[PDB]
Design a protein around this ligand. Sequence first.
Ligand SMILES: CC(=O)N[C@H]1[C@@H](O[C@@H]2[C@H](O)[C@@H](O)[C@H](O)O[C@@H]2CO)O[C@H](CO)[C@@H](O)[C@@H]1O
Ligand SMILES: [Ca+2]
Length: 886
Amino acid sequence: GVEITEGVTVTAKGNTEGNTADLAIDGDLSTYWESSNDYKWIEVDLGGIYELSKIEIFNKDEAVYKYNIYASEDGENFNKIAYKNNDNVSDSNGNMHTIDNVRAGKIRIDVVQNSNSDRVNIAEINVFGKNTGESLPEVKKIATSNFSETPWATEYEKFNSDSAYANEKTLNEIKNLVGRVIGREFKDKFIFEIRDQLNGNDVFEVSDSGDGKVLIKGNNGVSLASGFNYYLKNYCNVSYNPIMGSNLKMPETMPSVGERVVIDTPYEHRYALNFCTYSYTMSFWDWDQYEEFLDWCAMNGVNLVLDIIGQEEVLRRTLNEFGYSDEEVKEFISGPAYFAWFYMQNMTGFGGPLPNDWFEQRAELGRKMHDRMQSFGINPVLQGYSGMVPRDFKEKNQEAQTISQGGWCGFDRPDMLKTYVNEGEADYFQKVADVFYEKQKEVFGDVTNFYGVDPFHQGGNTGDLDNGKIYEIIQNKMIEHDNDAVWVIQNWQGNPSNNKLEGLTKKDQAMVLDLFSEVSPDWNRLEERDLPWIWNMLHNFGGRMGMDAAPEKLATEIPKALANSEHMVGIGITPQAINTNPLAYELLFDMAWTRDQINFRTWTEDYIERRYGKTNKEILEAWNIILDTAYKKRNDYYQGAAESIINARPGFGIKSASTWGHSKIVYDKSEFEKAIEIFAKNYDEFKDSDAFLYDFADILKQLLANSAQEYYEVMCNAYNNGNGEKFKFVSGKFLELIKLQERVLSTRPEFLIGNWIEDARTMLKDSDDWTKDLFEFNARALVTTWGSRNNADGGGLKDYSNRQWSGLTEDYYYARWEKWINGLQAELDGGAKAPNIDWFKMEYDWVNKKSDTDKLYPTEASNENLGELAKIAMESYSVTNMDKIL
Ligand SMILES: CC(=O)N[C@H]1[C@@H](O[C@@H]2[C@H](O)[C@@H](O)[C@H](O)O[C@@H]2CO)O[C@H](CO)[C@@H](O)[C@@H]1O
Ligand SMILES: [Ca+2]
């Protein structure tokens, strides 16, 4: 005691009709709050700060509920104070939770599971404790600085206006990059010089200084970084890729250049990133990871990079002028793992709300990025505005005209303002657009001429409006705010249609990304309309893993495209994640620096030598086998790497793990196994190359995915033939195969689910338990169910971002197969028919577990020996030995 029976109030962010929040605290067990959306929590204010001793919870029925309870004494920080994760049914006695005398003015109760429904409920909640006689403080309003008032503005302007200062900054930064990439002791081995463009093209030079130093010139920072990279790769046998394995072992003495080299690129732009990349890869990155990424960008010639960092603050300021409180803005914006689909106008809300201190921190990170990009000569692509507004925009602005955009994968898309209206009507597109571009400037300053926005992406609705006219007016509005604007536009699945693209009256002030040029190029219709366009390798969908690359097409189609066009202004990468197949990315960026087709085989021979720090005939043999199998040219349409059956919801007739995926392996499996035999034979000699280990894990996990598919077919045959004993034996081998795969995956830091989760939980400074748990939810959901039931199932997103990852394989993929197998076994053995499994409910149970109360996944890779694991795989879980094995 004592029960807090006066002054208690409650809020929620959704409820089913009649089942309002206040019904959780009305003293009546027959009335309840019940959730209507993904906000499955309520917030109770106690009318003062109490030292809490007990919290009692009643539900409306006898289902099994799981929930987490949080408390705040300062009004800002909600820390976790109790939870129920046991499988006990609720009953008429309620659940009583002992609280260790925690001070609290407000509590949050998040009900993350109801065994009986997707909706959750609370019939009553009682809180017991001792009044402190104190009151919560007022919560400080969100406040950020204007760019113009920060030291960032001073520096940005000083760089702009003082050549000498700017040159010194660029040259010092490139020296810093050498230090970060190969070590501080190499900084004094290079001399860097700015030069002019060659014939209007970016250019670098590499030569000997005369006293044993390396003289590298370039027209800007990116060119200088590319020259540094060229020297490493061609003279030092060194290869940098901070995400996908490097060989950074330098020679004992700096090798001589010999004949001076001058190398230019005919491309104005070399472009990087997909909106999706910001979610499947970068969601939880800190500055250190961004810095490393930008160094790798500059070294690979990249000078145009999609940038959404801190855009939440831009949108907050914009909507604040159109009747939205900061709380309402936070409900509209997604969580940290969903910004890709938030900014592509596909979804709102989900994974949020973001913490109040998000906005300042992210605006600061964005400013820091623009400072580094400015030093290098990298253009960010910031945001264009095309009419995106929340669905209640007219409620708050009654003269606005809007077009409902309908649904995307079960989410509600935001509305779109009518891009033009009749004489006599208010034009909110003009009004909001003017505020948006002005607020973007207040937050970041004038950092670029490139802006990206993509109305009608993967659906939406043009209403009564003329397609060309919509594009004309959006383009005109962008140009009004930046006379030198270039509207960067994604070309995907025929959006924007020719009639839309013909609306762009200023063709030189648009630039279309041909998104998927290495599989389904679609630049002819751009070229024919005289639109500047960029040739892009997409390659990676969802972060889905496997050996997959198109090196022959990259070595040939790119210079062919250049030879056969007048408006190809660049090449680039548009991957949905940067986690796989380093060969593809290195080759793509190498193709910027030639006008000629090259030989992709000899290119690979040189590539693997610098990647491993050594080579021999057998390693070269194994890579020729990879080029002839997994990396062999394909002429069909497919999205990402062939999917592992291990990662699919269990069932019969499986042909993909994700809706738009494919599991068909188009090469000979036993032939591919030979590459693994060759790597095992050479393991001891190459184990001191981390990049060799990286590649060996990739090909080995590919072998096991490949053989798992064959064992799956045999297992399904055994069930269909009513052979219980054979099914037990074969399904048994299938599960053991997954266990071996888990040992393979354990060997790489890049494969640990624990790193992804820990990054999410630690990405901000000083965040409360509430925010950590919510960010962990974002991390777990994105790689599994993606959204909730109507998104995963009816919406098609289940396992879209499936990862061949350690921890995730044991507790999620393995657990699904085991469950399906056991049900089939029980039936074959004479038991009841195998039950339907509700996959989403089982999957979601995993999504909602927390690292601090359930299981903490490790952040350290194992010492398993990939050579020995490969021998076990060849001997006991292979396609080659399958007849012998089964
Ligand atoms: C969920 C996701 O990352 N979607 C991507 C993806 O779209 C999916 C698929 O590739 C399309 O063929 C299908 O029409 O829609 C799918 C679900 O959105 O690819 C595109 C292209 O990069 C992305 O824009 C989506 O965001
Ligand atoms: Ca009640």
